[PDB]
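To assess whether the prediction recovers the assembly geometry, we first specified each molecular entity separately, as shown.
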Amino acid sequence: VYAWNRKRISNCVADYSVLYNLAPFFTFKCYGVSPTKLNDLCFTNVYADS
Amino acid sequence: YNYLYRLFRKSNLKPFERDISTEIYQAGNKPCNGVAGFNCYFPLRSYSFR
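The predicted structure of the complete assembly is given in tokenized form:
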């Protein structure tokens, strides 16, 4: 966590159903946007931390 | 915490329509109908004004 890596994902399509349908014991405390309206529309400059 | 707000639902509201039903919305395909971190999560949240 002190050196949290930043991963940028671009030039592809990001399907969120894979995350929803696998490893069932995860929490989804998203803020500001609903997963269904995450799927119907989209955005740019995917940034992923870990 | 007495003030509660709904951000998660299947469909939009018609003008001047009130929704009071508290049914957990299922992001996943399977309607598990059980409170969890992600699956069958409670639809309306509560604020914490301070």
